[model samples]
Target: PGEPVVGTGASLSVELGPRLLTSIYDGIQRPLEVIREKTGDFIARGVTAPALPRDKKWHFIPKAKVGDKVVGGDIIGEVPETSIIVHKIMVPPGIEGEIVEIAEEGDYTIEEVIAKVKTPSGEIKELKMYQRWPVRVKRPYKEKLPPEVPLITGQRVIDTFFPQAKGGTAAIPGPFGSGKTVTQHQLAKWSDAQVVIYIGCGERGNEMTDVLEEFPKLKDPKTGKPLMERTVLIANTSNMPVAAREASIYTGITIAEYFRDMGYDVALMADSTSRWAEALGYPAYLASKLAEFYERAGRVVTLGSDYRVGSVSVIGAVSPPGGDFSEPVVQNTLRVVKVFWALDADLARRRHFPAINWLTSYSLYVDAVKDWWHKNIDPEWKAMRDKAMALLQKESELQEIVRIVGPDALPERERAILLVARMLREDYLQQDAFDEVDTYCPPEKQVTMMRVLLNFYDKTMEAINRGVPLEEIAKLPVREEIGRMKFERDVSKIRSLIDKTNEQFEELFKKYGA
Candidate 1:
């Protein structure tokens, strides 16, 4: 039989298997080991390999018996692939049959036909340990659920401010050295996703090598195992074939969807979709292509008689030449993705690490996730986030005025806004990706930290209204401590810092002739 073609009501093929967590693959789902074995030095043209270990033996145990009616995605058996994950042997899609002959629990290679089933058409269908599906097709699902929960990236600017849902889509558009790669790395390392698919499409070979070398050394916060145990990397560097580069994103999403079918919350980060778009050789189709890719992100029900919930959250990075947002790739990406993490060149130039321009960046998932934050993390999260963003917005407008007319020309309130905005930028938004403690700021600590800064803003405003000078409040020693609070590892210590900040600010207000 021929594969399904792209058309109305046509289903596409999807490839899925075990040990995906331990092994890394290329754009076309070729296992890194197979690629290395075939081409010892460099990736040769037309070189291809199987994603799974074709010759390795797996102990398959049959769950279904003879005369049992089974459909696609029904768990037939399982193979203990690793200490942490059990690989479920599922009935491949488009197959409804009765189990006639089943393999005993024994060692057999993946290529061997482990089981046989009697189809309704009176035909015997053979089952192998591994199955291949088309990279373009989305895995079959029962239904798509509404996304309501937050992804909880542990980045203060993301979680406490512009949050994305567990199955939401986000775009990070930035120029070179604007921390786009670092941002994606942070999400891969710390986000609350069960599985991470990092696609280094059109990125440097050395950068991909760094990911290969660095991932194994890091540990998963939840499982306490190597992060690679939950990660699947797909590398097609800039020097690789352009055709492979274009297919890398699709290959990644397909694998992620496969995990989602297994009821896993999968997060896929594709760095520089611009490269992929360019490689396609058709700029006009970029928007539609980008939309199609993002359209796959959602909370869904898998294709089993027993309904199971799963999710695939996609985060893509776009590189606009010369940091211009007018570029087609960046504009198209923005239209499709719900969340936009706009990394600003000015911020990067100023050494503000994440460099995400809050003015241009926004999350449509914020309202969807408000109740989650209120119920789980903090009740006042929404209000605080709004206020901080409002301050930044006001500062953005005032900045234009200050550029034309110096800071001395602005009124006291406007000046106060600028100072608070600076605190928000320097103290809150700027996070060190390398710091052990500050690298991943928890939701609770994010709330406390923001509250501390907001409290300072309120106290400073009151002090200013009560006849205290703006310069005096800005110069207060407490302002410096607020900048240092992000570095404090302990949540209790953060709370203590907040208390101390409030106390010292109150003293400053009293000392300012209040």
Candidate 2:
């Protein structure tokens, strides 16, 4: 009764991190499956259950010797957490000592004390298979590494045009009409990461129901297991109170950092992150507060003697009032997040599945990720991207003038820009999420597709200048063949389209065909 009770923050059980995969948790880390079993589908008030299974036995293997001195961050042992993950039972941060007593290899529950360490002061500190951390506190790391590698999403538009780093900050802003449903889900499924944590914070009612039914059915193309096997879902749907939804934001990042400590690449998708402010009462500290949330993402060197580096990338779901970019929330969000993927309603109305605006969207991680693209994929990637962007940029300006004066008024050279740029947007950038090959694009395919379009543009521009009619060029049979090249899985086959472009254009310049 005499002792002082101090508040740390919301406690995150270390054991929760290992079993995170395949588990859908409530805002406070309670397993919703358990909650469902205890109550109805609506989740009745004042119910309690363990977030982690208390009775299930785990096969533990010892990594440390009996006489070995151990410190924090050192692995005491590991439990086979899942088929795809090995749970490293790290010595809790801020506690270190010589080994006093250690548990033998056997099947045991997480509650059992597996280790005993003696401080120099002769006090015994018993260590379990788990520890606790505050959700509000950031984890300690040795250093923050540079954003030097691309976090490949396998989405054609994002990977080719606006790539984000493995552990960098990014945002996906979309309105109600345009829809972020497909774009956000595609990334969570296709992005290359060892672990994925998705937080559903009071998103649209229909979208929440859509994810639960849809997300579990999707399997990993790489492993054949359900993607949920490697995913941790923090679900605080639109029905939940505002404070619970706000707490879920921190709950996700805390879990991401825990996995980062184990040297796994993590992608934390904070879905409907903007909705957090709906819970907030103050407006004066909005921008400053938002800055800190995005600042958590980065590639990091974990604190330990072991040589390991981990990453945590964040793709925040941004929703602006009235779909206006000039709104305070969108402006403030842009200042903090380096990568911006704006899904325009105009693009959606045109039937583009991704609907990521090529003209207004941006990626500042380009310089950091470009060198990696050069080393890993192709040397001409940067130049190829730059060329396509110029065509897209010029076409947009040309489109406005064409609207008032009409396209027929433009000269032959300017007319060629519109024709080829349409190919860039339609045949190259636009992709089908439901189709087999078009759904997930490889980086090699991304580069090959861009080359085919650029080749067509170059030859067509040259042919028109040589006095060939734009009418004949548009009517060429090769144009129809170029459209179907996107479905090809083999790049060696698609690479032939560029040669086909040259062959067909030569016949036009020779004036043999109409």
Candidate 3:
């Protein structure tokens, strides 16, 4: 009764540091080392584990002195824990205090009090080299900035059509076997983010196992390092406890925010968030929880004087049952995310690898990224994109009429549209994920390939008006050559092919022969 009791409140302090990567954690961010060490099997109930190694001694070197003022996310000291990484010790959030004591350069455990601070409120707060943060709370930032730069995923369908801005939110909803996992994996491997946090929440253990085995062997395209070095995995398989499964997403975002505070562009991939929503006992609160998780993604200014800018780009996979978009999880996710890469099961059935439904998929960031495309890529980029969309959308409307009345009954111009739209879908939208060259498409290559297709459209349209039959124009061997343009590895080869095709079309039109 004589002892003091602290009052409970809504706010919680969040931890930040440079030692976040090259690790694996469970849904609640508990390091898996202790679980394996004690249980001997994979995981068991009631197993307690420290977030980091408690017994291992670390050589702490102080960078700040006594009476030095520090705020949240400021790096005070560093520890060369490994040959590859230097662990930076950051001040925890909500701490505006003068350092009173700091440990000397010597061997010490994570639990050791490396530093002490006298706060503005006159409280002597003991600080460890590592700290804990609640998964639900968001890390503090100086200010949220407008997300204008594209994340630049090397997927043609996503980058050219449905682009997600850096620090923006995107939702990929697909039915079973609709290539959702492959798309997520592609982005994880190819996006320009400095760090990736992949959350396999309530997914199959085998899928998580695949990621565990494959990522370490895979190389990052930009850095040429093992992808594992820049990745943090939070895996809560379907077999895990439901409470932890529901907590996995929050755990992932909090880790992403930590990296963002360190001024790294972090991309978070949550595969099949529908399963996560299902893991929560109450369905009514699922939407609110999802909103809270996605709300953490943004470009922001860090709290220190360095004033570095960082971003957290969140891409959530929503598995709508039977690929029905009307489901509550998909609908709720659609409302929160700006970019939608809606996958179509019908296209997947036809063996389209990406299966992203161009008709239904869209990017609200198009207007925002227009300046980037115009300045960096091409001035006519928006015009080309809009024309391609118009052709696809028109073909969709005409296909309905053709289903009732055969293609022969439609007008020649409409038939030409059908032919061009088919070329777009087969050549541009359907990417071969397994192919070495075709797997990753650069923005420059994307623009050139699109121009080739549009050039074909323009030539065929003029040929049809010149009295050539649509079927005759479609039968040209050059059409197949255009289809193979996307497969060309070198941009120069594609350009040469385009030039030769243009010459061939000109000669064919001059003769006016079948």
Candidate 4:
């Protein structure tokens, strides 16, 4: 009667929260390697061990005292879990009273009591270095708030067009080789979030194995520290238990909420939500749970006595059957998530690096993050975005005519748009994830890149009006220079290329004589 019959669920050992980074765990938060060490490769039934190491002692620093008034959410102490992260120990949410006693700074196991608080009802409540919350329950927050700041993923398509806010929900619906993992990898590596939680949800075991093993060796691009210092990886690969796979998503989320309570900006990048949904044999309430999962993410006020803001961004990959999104999972997910990044097959065949179709994908976060760009970069940031998208969207419409009646049949204005749209696709939007120099572009570099391309548009349109031939404009040597600008390492030097392009446009103005 105490728990669900034959039911298994997950618990959060508060001690495991700080130690989570750099460590990879199975679907239910068991450290797989440790389990392997105990079981030695073969399946062992009902073997019980601590999720965190019981043998190792954490060097604890005491922050509470014997005589101080204390609340449940107050900082209890700190543990330097990694070189980059100082994991703070806070009083558990259920306990509140004056501190009766607190241990001095020293080494202690998670089982060891750190504080004894005098409850208001005159009971002395002992507190351990660890605590537990069942994974199914949504953790409490002071207030739910709107997300304003952009996550600033270095992908040009995501950041400029279909931006997700710092605490937003996004869906990546694609078939195999649509760069889903590549896209998620880029977000994990470069998105401006303080903490990372990557859940490898029932993707095939071998593929999940690669990500699991690879994460330990990954390094932060800017900090140069091991990425695990601020990362938590949850592996629930295929061939693992389906029930456990279902638990993995919530288990990962509970861990994320614990960190969010610590006032951290966290991102939960689940490799999929499809298999997790499939685990339950495709329930009738797919829409019910889909909203349930996405609703957990948002910028919010934390529940501590002090006012602190925190956030969680939920970005999940939804694999539509055979790349057709008419299926249930993608349909339900699209209705709930604010950002939909549809990975297109037609684009993938053409070898666009991202393969995120600018035409099909849309983001409701545009208005939310627009102010961020305007305030931080320029008021014209949205204008540049709107202009760039217009050219691309126009190209899609213009593409229909090109295939039927040859492109040369179009008027000069339409042809000018066609040329600029090609630049948008090939130069501005396409990012080579494999190229070291071209992989990541900061907002400053991205905006400047767009400026360069759009400038060419304005200049080309002027030349068209001045009777300068499209052939002459298209064949200009500067076109090649502009095309290669994306691969350049320096954003500042690209300015001179923009200037050079203008001078070439001027040369055409003098020669055309119309």
lDDT of 1 by residue, 30-61 (tens): 66633321111112234445466666778888
lDDT of 3 by residue, 1-514 (tens): 0122233312222334434566777766666522321111122233465455667778888989998998887777888754434566778888879999998888888788889989999998888887767666687899999878899988888988899999999988632223334786788888988788987655453666665676678777666777777888777665566656666777788888877877778899887734453434466577777788889999999776567888999988777675566888888888899999877767777888787888888899988887898899878888988999999889898988888977767788887888899999888888888887888889898888888889888888988888877767888888887788778888877767677767877777877865
Report the lDDT of model 3 for residue 280.
Answer: 40
- Error at 62, model 1, angstroms: 5.9
Q: List pairs with backbone clashes in candidate 2.
A: none
Tell me the tens digit of each residue's lDDT in model 2 across 46-125.
Answer: 34566667677888888887677776677888888767678888887777778888889998887888889887787888
List where candidate 3 sits over 4 angstroms from the true fold.
1-19, 33-47, 55-70, 76-89, 96-129, 174-181, 221-224, 273-285, 321-324, 468-472, 475-478
User: RMSD of model 2, in Å?
Assistant: 4.6
Off by over 4 Å in 1: 1-14, 33-48, 59-71, 76-84, 96-107, 112-127, 174-181, 203-224, 238-240, 273-286, 321-323, 409-411, 475-477, 497-514
**TM-score winner, 2 or 4:** 4
The count of backbone overlaps in candidate 4 is 0
Model 3 poorest 10 in a row by lDDT? 36-45
Model 2: lDDT of residue 492: 88
The candidate maximizing TM-score is 4
Candidate 2 Cα lDDT to native: 0.77
Q: RMSD for all candidates, in order, please.
A: 5.0, 4.6, 5.2, 4.4
Model 4 lDDT tens row, 1-514: 0222223331222234446767777756777643321111112132344466666678889887788887756777888888777777877777788898899999987788888999889999988776777666777787888879899889999999999998899988632223333776777878888788888765562666567566678888768898888888887665665655666777788888878877888899876634454443345576787689788898888776678877899988887655567887778888899998877768878888688889889999999999999999767889999999988878888898788887667899898999989988999889988888777988888888888898999999999998888989999998898888888888887877779889999898889776
